Design a protein around this ligand. Sequence first.
Ligand SMILES: [Mn+2]
Ligand SMILES: [Mn+2]
Lengths: 183, 180
Amino acid sequence: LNYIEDIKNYIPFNEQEERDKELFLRCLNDFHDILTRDNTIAHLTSSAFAVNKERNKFLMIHHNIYNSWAWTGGHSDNEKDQLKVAIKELKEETGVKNPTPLLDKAFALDVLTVNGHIKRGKYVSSHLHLNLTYLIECSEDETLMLKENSGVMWIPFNEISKYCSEPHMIPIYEKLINKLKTQ
Amino acid sequence: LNYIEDIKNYIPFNEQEERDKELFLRCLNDFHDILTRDNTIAHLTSSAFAVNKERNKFLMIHHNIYNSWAWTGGHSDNEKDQLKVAIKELKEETGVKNPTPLLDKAFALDVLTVNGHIKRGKYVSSHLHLNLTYLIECSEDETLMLKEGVMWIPFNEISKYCSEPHMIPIYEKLINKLKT
Ligand SMILES: [Mn+2]
Ligand SMILES: [Mn+2]
């Protein structure tokens, strides 16, 4: 589903998504390009709410440097199909081969911060990531493998708060689970 | 100095300031206004690099959050003179009586992030702070009292008080520019 209309028609799950969607629209209205990193202020990214058949676990990767786990995802980088971007990043970061989307439109919407940092000698200013999340199922039979991140693992929903140590990301993961739970 | 002129004419100290200044200008171009929280994407804020007479201590404040120490500052909230904003915040947060600015224009420029959070029931989406820092001197003789801890922090141990990894290089920047 085209990102622009998918975003405009997205139905907020809660207040956070209500406010964030509003920011998304302002961006679409104020920037002719929110698809690439040419927009140093904000741009689209996609993430994978990778779950198992039983809908018991959340497939996440262990961030390098930090002893914290997180979902996979990445920059749209001019690829209009956000779902395709989510699938691609999930495959590359976890090693999974045959993930299957369970829904075609965004499953979640979040505006995320990105602190300024240096990448290949280049300083990239602090900015916002307009993240769309996609519901995708993966087989536990899949063979997991890291990407020099430092680990991949199936994380139980009721134990994410114990594996994830990024305070701000917890409520987002919990949101994903609660929403899935209502279906 | 009138912020807009302050911004446009600020001379970058290093690369991050070069890139950050570019983001500031882009905001001036694309955004209706950047002086109030009406702008949910980005808005002007001012901070204080409050230094002691000997220029060896950084007057900072403790955040009951993740046990971290940081500079004083706040939203411009429509006030255009940013030194006045910084001075105001410094007084409020530290209780300093007669702070003395050493420069009449911005001492540093930084684009900072602010994670989405709940403020008195309302959710405030993640956004950016277009921060200007001001060089202000304060006497260690000033009686200091927090507001529901305040402390002068030697430059060489700032990294030991700051729990936000990304703020470390900022403070180091201030301290380096000051040295030169
Ligand atoms: Mn980015
Ligand atoms: Mn703000």
